[PDB]
Amino acid sequence: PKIHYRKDYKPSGFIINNVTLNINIHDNETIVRSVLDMDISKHNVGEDLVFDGVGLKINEISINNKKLVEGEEYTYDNEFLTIFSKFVPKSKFAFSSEVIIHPETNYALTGLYKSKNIIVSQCEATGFRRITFFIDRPDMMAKYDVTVTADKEKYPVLLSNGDKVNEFEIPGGRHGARFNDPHLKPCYLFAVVAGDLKHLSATYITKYTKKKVELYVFSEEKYVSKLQWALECLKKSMAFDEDYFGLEYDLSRLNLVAVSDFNVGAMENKGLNIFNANSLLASKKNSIDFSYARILTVVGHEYFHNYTGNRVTLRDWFQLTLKEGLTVHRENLFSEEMTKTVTTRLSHVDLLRSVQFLEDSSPLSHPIRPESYVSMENFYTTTVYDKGSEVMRMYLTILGEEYYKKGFDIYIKKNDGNTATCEDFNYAMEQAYKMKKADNSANLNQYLLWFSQSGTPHVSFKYNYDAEKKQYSIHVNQYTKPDENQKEKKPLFIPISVGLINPENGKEMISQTTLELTKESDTFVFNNIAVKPIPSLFRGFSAPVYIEDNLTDEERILLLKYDSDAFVRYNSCTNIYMKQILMNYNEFLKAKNEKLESFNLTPVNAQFIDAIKYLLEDPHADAGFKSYIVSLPQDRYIINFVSNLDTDVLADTKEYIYKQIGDKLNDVYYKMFKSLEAKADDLTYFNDESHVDFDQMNMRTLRNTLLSLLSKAQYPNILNEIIEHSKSPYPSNWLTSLSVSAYFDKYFELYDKTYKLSKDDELLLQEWLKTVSRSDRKDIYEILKKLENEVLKDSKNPNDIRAVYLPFTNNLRRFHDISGKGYKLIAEVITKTDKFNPMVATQLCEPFKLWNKLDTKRQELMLNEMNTMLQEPNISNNLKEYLLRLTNKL
Ligand SMILES: [Mg+2]
Ligand SMILES: [Mg+2]
Ligand SMILES: [Mg+2]
Ligand SMILES: [Zn+2]
């Protein structure tokens, strides 16, 4: 396979200054004429001029109006256009091409494609070369003049990046529009859209300069009503970047566009952000609660890229985390400010420690700045995004808000209008660090290891208290497991946010402080500590590590009840759960492998269950927090702690633990399910698409979590509650009623009821598909076959394919059926999908990432299916790289 290496980066011998495009859309072809105003750089050594250009049909090629001919002045192999050096000018020149492309048959959704009746582009990372020839890499920055023409009746709205500078009629019922984007950009930020789109709009006046910005949000006509929350989220986003970062929008217009067929969530094209409809459109009658948070986050994310990615862009794709880690950090700051709920940060932590930790212990483990790739699309990973965001957040923890803001400013201003690298960012932060420490010899050179070193650090603790001296110590050790990226691991700069809790009275004993661990081990000592404390470690989850708290369950309970920090309370709960899960898993595993006729299980700690009851019954405690405490850790979290995992033993373990606790708490759960109803399902704001009460949303999640626990328990007469809950106006409730009805004969009646409620809204139907797919049904395989035949059919819409299959892959007992039939089913879907959408196919590989964690029978079954997929003729480069790396062949 062709591999690209970070260390091999070199500036191009060429410069592209201006791009002038004419994109003429017809029924059965689109013609792209492009003029590149180019020059020779100071790095040129008289090389051939080589353009990327994938699957283009050439009409004409010229330089300075000299026609060039195949085999004489150029070669084209359907991937690269090589202009031989003799015909490459030595000073500024005009390169002209005209090619034919076919959006109507572009089911890969990269380049120019058709999504329902909308023509749309996606260029990040390497899609622009599927539209026209280019030196398609992000250091080739240029200015764009784009004309789009099409049939006026079919495609009345025409958009490209920047200012609309003309609109005109064309004979034969056609029309055109011309766009000028005055901001230099890499080609991955080009976009065009053509469609019968409807819109909502508003005017926003910037905070400092008072610039009037016109905000447009667009969709197909059927769904225009569902645009309102996205428009509000955009205004919130603009105001947050102004308020926190001093950053104002930099064009007279910003358009957001929803399309039905999109490989990811959205895309930050300059002035023209394009979204998966699932991440832009909602209405309260037709969307689950989680859509609201998703839209806030995705709108914010793409908006924040306007500076962290667009105004400062990437030198090369190895630097991806510079824009994604940083942008995810910005959107997390924004969403924590907008939602004002502790469960927002907790959800980010849960994501990282489940999916990203799994990745980082897998054969796919990479640092957040990778050293090599075949298909850059395979490095848009939870590592680069989520570990990247945590590395970007640690700078704020280390510097505090004022100095973080100063370092950020240094970065964004120095590199404005240009490319940057991870080093540039670290250097700006280092400037702020010198200022914070008032020491111009302090440096963050060690910090760079967070970019280059793979794997998750493990941080462990020991404690000592001297009662006579009133002195306490915390001894800390870090360890990162060697891997294929580094045989020798180095210690990182790990910021440890800490408090100390008095176990007598539950009160804070120190001003919170952040310990700066830089060595492999260190001991931090505290004086004037009046009683032996319980330490509250890694507050806010202050580094992306495995924490070994070395606390007793009694200590953990006291923190769960009394600490101030949400994360530590939740983590202490998590750790009590983990200790139980491991112990019970081992007891079940021994019983199974020894074929014992009887054995013991360690019961769940009774004082821990009392603590759960105390928290749930506290009318002043947080509803979202409560839903985290009654839930066991995610299976993908748990699997980071078990080698040769027998999935069926794990399912048995979880069931036992849940049943132990419900046998004590089900009456509390039922009482709370009823008591929370009035506030949870109050209809304030039900007609207001500009406002969401996230606390109320958390109350609904708590109610629906409790209902699931009581339904699996078969709590007496709970089917009555299930039927009532199905009549709620909130889709989060009525779809929950379907899921929880899985344990009852009413399942298929609720399946039909909710289908009918869902079938006339594209996105609600996809949410119904996910609800079915995730259902805890013994007959899940027959239900999946029913979904395939009656609803999915031959959809190539990634959202439909993902909705049917991915939730089912999270079914621990059924997806991991020892026959291998779940592995075979998903491998067939992957291979089917790879023939038209390689990116989606690689997404659908997700459940195989943990293969080498499983028991050896399931390792074998998984490996057989991965090798079967690797044998498939015409396998994509995306899938082949992914599977070769995952199976230890690359
Ligand atoms: Mg083609
Ligand atoms: Mg993105
Ligand atoms: Mg459809
Ligand atoms: Zn992004």
Side-chain angles (χ1 to χ4, degrees):
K2 165 59 186 188
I3 303 172
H4 300 286
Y5 297 93
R6 186 177 72 90
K7 70 182 181 219
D8 289 343
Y9 175 81
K10 290 290 106 143
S12 174
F14 304 98
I15 301 163
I16 300 163
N17 289 319
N18 295 266
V19 181
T20 304
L21 300 182
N22 286 260
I23 295 167
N24 299 316
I25 298 160
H26 293 272
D27 303 319
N28 296 312
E29 62 185 12
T30 288
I31 308 291
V32 184
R33 190 167 184 86
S34 177
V35 175
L36 308 184
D37 289 305
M38 295 187 63
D39 203 356
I40 305 300
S41 81
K42 62 199 188 193
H43 302 111
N44 185 274
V45 294
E47 66 265 45
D48 295 337
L49 165 57
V50 182
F51 294 105
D52 306 287
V54 171
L56 310 176
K57 186 195 177 323
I58 299 175
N59 275 351
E60 69 172 300
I61 306 295
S62 59
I63 294 182
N64 298 329
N65 305 119
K66 170 198 172 71
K67 175 180 180 61
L68 305 183
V69 164
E70 188 173 5
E72 302 244 19
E73 297 85 28
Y74 78 81
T75 59
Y76 181 52
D77 68 358
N78 257 288
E79 183 170 17
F80 304 113
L81 169 69
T82 300
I83 314 303
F84 312 131
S85 76
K86 284 183 170 173
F87 308 103
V88 182
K90 308 286 199 288
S91 65
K92 289 200 351 283
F93 62 99
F95 176 85
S96 173
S97 62
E98 185 176 278
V99 299
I100 306 187
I101 65 182
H102 296 281
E104 63 283 357
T105 51
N106 182 356
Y107 308 118
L109 321 184
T110 66
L112 191 67
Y113 67 101
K114 194 162 184 168
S115 175
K116 199 173 308 184
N117 285 320
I118 301 172
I119 291 285
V120 54
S121 65
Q122 173 56 31
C123 296
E124 193 177 357
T126 61
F128 188 76
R129 64 190 67 174
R130 295 179 188 274
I131 300 182
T132 186
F133 293 110
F134 210 76
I135 302 172
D136 179 7
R137 48 182 275 183
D139 60 338
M140 302 303 301
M141 300 178 66
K143 290 170 66 204
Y144 290 66
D145 172 347
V146 176
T147 297
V148 185
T149 73
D151 182 74
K152 190 177 189 173
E153 171 96 317
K154 193 141 37 175
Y155 298 111
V157 179
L158 302 176
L159 304 168
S160 192
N161 312 86
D163 291 0
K164 187 165 60 180
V165 301
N166 195 29
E167 299 176 278
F168 55 96
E169 296 292 298
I170 299 167
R174 297 179 66 80
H175 71 140
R178 185 175 203 161
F179 296 82
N180 290 343
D181 180 356
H183 290 285
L184 250 208
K185 64 163 176 292
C187 65
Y188 81 84
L189 292 173
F190 170 80
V192 57
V193 181
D196 188 8
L197 305 169
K198 303 299 173 181
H199 71 266
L200 306 174
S201 70
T203 302
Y204 187 92
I205 298 170
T206 69
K207 181 167 182 202
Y208 304 101
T209 59
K210 305 296 181 91
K211 170 181 200 164
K212 212 160 312 278
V213 182
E214 299 327 318
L215 308 181
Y216 291 79
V217 295
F218 292 93
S219 74
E220 67 179 285
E221 181 177 354
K222 184 170 198 275
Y223 298 120
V224 71
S225 58
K226 295 179 71 177
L227 285 164
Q228 299 171 63
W229 176 237
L231 181 53
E232 175 57 29
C233 290
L234 183 58
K235 297 175 187 176
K236 294 181 186 314
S237 308
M238 292 181 80
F240 183 81
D241 227 357
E242 286 168 341
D243 294 346
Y244 191 105
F245 291 100
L247 296 174
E248 297 181 315
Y249 187 68
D250 59 346
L251 286 171
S252 291
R253 182 150 164 185
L254 177 47
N255 296 317
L256 317 183
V257 178
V259 298
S260 289
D261 300 86
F262 208 70
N263 290 336
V264 298
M267 176 69 213
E268 70 265 28
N269 318 289
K270 184 76 175 193
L272 183 47
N273 296 353
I274 297 173
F275 291 75
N276 187 325
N278 74 20
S279 303
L280 204 65
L281 303 180
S283 75
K284 285 171 191 196
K285 193 180 180 179
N286 281 1
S287 308
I288 67 165
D289 286 347
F290 293 159
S291 292
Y292 290 80
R294 174 71 176 167
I295 291 162
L296 179 65
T297 286
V298 175
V299 169
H301 181 107
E302 310 309 335
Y303 182 74
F304 298 137
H305 271 310
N306 194 48
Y307 282 85
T308 55
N310 300 3
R311 284 284 289 269
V312 185
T313 190
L314 308 183
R315 185 192 77 175
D316 56 68
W317 292 117
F318 302 94
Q319 314 307 318
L320 185 56
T321 201
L322 180 60
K323 75 182 180 76
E324 297 302 348
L326 184 50
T327 297
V328 174
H329 166 63
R330 288 160 40 74
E331 173 276 324
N332 289 174
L333 289 170
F334 166 65
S335 293
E336 287 173 46
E337 183 73 27
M338 295 302 96
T339 64
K340 300 186 192 310
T341 56
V342 295
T343 55
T344 300
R345 173 66 179 146
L346 300 184
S347 74
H348 302 162
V349 179
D350 203 343
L351 186 299
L352 183 84
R353 300 201 302 176
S354 60
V355 180
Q356 195 278 329
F357 285 8
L358 182 173
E359 182 168 270
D360 231 346
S361 62
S362 80
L364 296 174
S365 178
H366 44 290
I368 64 177
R369 183 180 63 191
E371 295 296 351
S372 70
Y373 60 82
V374 180
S375 279
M376 198 40 221
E377 285 82 359
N378 281 339
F379 291 77
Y380 286 71
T381 54
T382 184
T383 294
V384 165
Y385 278 66
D386 305 310
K387 183 173 169 170
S389 74
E390 299 295 303
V391 170
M392 292 294 183
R393 184 187 182 278
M394 279 181 290
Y395 286 118
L396 171 57
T397 297
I398 292 161
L399 292 171
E401 187 170 289
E402 156 169 324
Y403 286 102
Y404 176 71
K405 288 168 174 187
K406 292 179 162 151
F408 183 92
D409 273 1
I410 292 161
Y411 168 74
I412 212 71
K413 293 187 295 121
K414 176 171 331 177
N415 300 296
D416 185 51
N418 218 325
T419 61
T421 65
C422 296
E423 281 88 357
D424 297 320
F425 195 85
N426 195 63
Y427 166 89
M429 290 297 130
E430 180 178 273
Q431 292 288 292
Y433 189 67
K434 290 176 190 299
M435 296 164 64
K436 176 186 184 63
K437 292 300 183 88
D439 173 11
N440 288 334
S441 69
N443 70 67
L444 292 183
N445 179 67
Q446 185 184 18
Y447 204 86
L448 292 173
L449 292 162
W450 283 115
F451 292 90
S452 69
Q453 186 167 279
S454 64
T456 311
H458 294 254
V459 180
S460 56
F461 295 94
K462 300 277 196 164
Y463 318 108
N464 283 294
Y465 182 58
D466 175 341
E468 310 208 20
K469 300 282 181 293
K470 308 298 196 258
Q471 184 182 76
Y472 184 64
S473 61
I474 294 177
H475 175 60
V476 192
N477 189 84
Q478 62 170 300
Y479 163 84
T480 299
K481 185 186 187 171
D483 65 21
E484 290 290 357
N485 302 312
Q486 295 82 33
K487 61 177 272 170
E488 306 203 22
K489 299 279 180 180
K490 293 180 179 177
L492 301 184
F493 183 166
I494 301 180
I496 318 177
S497 187
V498 294
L500 300 170
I501 298 298
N502 180 336
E504 180 58 27
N505 71 4
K507 301 215 180 278
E508 311 290 331
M509 297 176 75
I510 63 172
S511 291
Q512 191 167 312
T513 187
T514 296
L515 318 173
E516 299 182 333
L517 176 65
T518 59
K519 300 190 293 192
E520 287 184 29
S521 67
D522 202 350
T523 299
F524 295 91
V525 191
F526 299 89
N527 278 323
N528 303 324
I529 302 299
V531 302
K532 186 192 195 191
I534 298 169
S536 170
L537 299 171
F538 284 106
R539 283 192 169 180
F541 191 58
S542 66
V545 304
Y546 289 108
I547 300 168
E548 305 181 5
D549 72 10
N550 243 104
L551 295 183
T552 68
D553 284 350
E554 295 57 47
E555 288 168 314
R556 295 162 175 166
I557 293 165
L558 285 160
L559 287 175
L560 173 60
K561 292 176 71 165
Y562 302 117
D563 197 354
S564 48
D565 188 67
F567 169 75
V568 176
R569 296 174 73 200
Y570 165 67
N571 201 44
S572 291
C573 184
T574 300
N575 298 339
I576 294 165
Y577 283 124
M578 280 310 304
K579 174 178 161 176
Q580 186 71 31
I581 288 158
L582 293 181
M583 175 64 61
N584 293 153
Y585 172 88
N586 193 57
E587 291 166 332
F588 276 121
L589 189 71
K590 286 186 41 189
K592 181 171 182 176
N593 288 342
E594 306 172 31
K595 310 195 154 196
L596 297 179
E597 298 306 323
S598 63
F599 56 107
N600 288 68
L601 291 164
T602 293
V604 178
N605 181 300
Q607 295 75 50
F608 172 54
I609 295 170
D610 288 339
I612 299 169
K613 182 179 199 295
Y614 173 95
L615 268 0
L616 285 177
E617 281 176 344
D618 180 351
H620 303 112
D622 184 82
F625 186 81
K626 291 178 187 184
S627 70
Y628 279 82
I629 70 166
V630 297
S631 305
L632 267 61
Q634 292 240 332
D635 290 343
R636 282 174 281 190
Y637 181 82
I638 295 165
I639 294 164
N640 298 324
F641 306 90
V642 185
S643 47
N644 294 26
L645 166 89
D646 186 319
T647 50
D648 204 70
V649 175
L650 178 64
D652 288 352
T653 297
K654 287 166 45 182
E655 282 208 49
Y656 167 74
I657 294 168
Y658 277 116
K659 191 72 176 27
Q660 285 251 304
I661 302 176
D663 279 358
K664 286 269 187 55
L665 295 192
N666 283 336
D667 295 341
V668 170
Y669 296 167
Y670 181 78
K671 185 187 64 236
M672 290 175 73
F673 177 76
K674 305 300 282 167
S675 68
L676 281 158
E677 191 173 352
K679 292 177 176 357
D681 290 346
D682 172 82
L683 292 167
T684 312
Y685 306 121
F686 199 59
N687 200 46
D688 186 348
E689 293 289 335
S690 75
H691 189 71
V692 171
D693 180 345
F694 288 96
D695 190 31
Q696 191 200 38
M697 173 175 310
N698 281 350
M699 290 171 207
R700 292 198 288 284
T701 293
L702 179 55
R703 288 191 85 221
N704 288 322
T705 301
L706 295 176
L707 184 60
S708 171
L709 297 167
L710 288 164
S711 301
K712 170 66 183 183
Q714 307 279 282
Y715 190 75
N717 295 130
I718 197 69
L719 185 57
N720 301 335
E721 303 301 341
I722 295 171
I723 295 283
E724 297 304 298
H725 205 59
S726 87
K727 297 172 190 182
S728 184
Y730 295 100
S732 285
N733 293 341
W734 64 251
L735 282 175
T736 292
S737 77
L738 177 60
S739 184
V740 305
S741 76
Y743 300 110
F744 294 91
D745 294 327
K746 272 280 279 179
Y747 183 76
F748 286 114
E749 282 172 36
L750 288 165
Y751 178 115
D752 295 344
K753 172 180 180 174
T754 59
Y755 177 72
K756 289 185 177 119
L757 293 176
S758 303
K759 67 184 175 66
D760 296 317
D761 177 298
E762 168 177 286
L763 298 174
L764 188 59
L765 183 52
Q766 290 159 8
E767 286 304 333
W768 179 85
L769 291 170
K770 290 179 179 188
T771 301
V772 173
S773 181
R774 206 193 300 115
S775 282
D776 186 6
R777 286 297 294 192
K778 293 184 206 96
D779 52 352
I780 198 66
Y781 287 84
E782 301 332 295
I783 291 166
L784 292 176
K785 186 175 303 98
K786 177 164 23 165
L787 297 179
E788 286 169 347
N789 300 326
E790 304 181 2
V791 186
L792 183 62
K793 310 199 182 168
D794 246 21
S795 189
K796 288 189 180 78
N797 182 326
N799 289 356
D800 290 334
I801 303 164
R802 292 181 289 242
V804 173
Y805 297 104
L806 288 175
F808 153 76
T809 70
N810 293 299
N811 184 322
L812 184 65
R813 214 171 270 291
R814 298 304 272 123
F815 173 68
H816 296 282
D817 187 279
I818 194 64
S819 63
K821 68 194 260 181
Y823 313 154
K824 175 186 171 82
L825 176 59
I826 298 300
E828 288 163 351
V829 176
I830 293 157
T831 291
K832 181 178 189 222
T833 300
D834 189 58
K835 293 170 161 49
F836 64 85
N837 194 320
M839 201 181 317
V840 181
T842 71
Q843 293 171 353
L844 295 163
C845 286
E846 201 249 25
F848 288 101
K849 299 172 77 182
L850 56 51
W851 75 269
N852 75 350
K853 300 308 310 294
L854 302 179
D855 64 80
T856 56
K857 181 57 60 163
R858 290 182 173 94
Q859 295 187 32
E860 177 189 25
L861 295 168
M862 279 197 167
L863 189 62
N864 284 343
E865 293 303 342
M866 290 186 284
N867 285 322
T868 295
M869 285 191 287
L870 274 165
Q871 293 293 124
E872 184 73 13
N874 284 0
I875 184 172
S876 68
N877 289 346
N878 298 65
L879 185 65
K880 185 190 172 144
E881 165 182 40
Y882 188 100
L883 292 177
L884 289 172
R885 288 195 192 284
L886 183 53
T887 58
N888 303 307
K889 299 161 184 132
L890 198 208

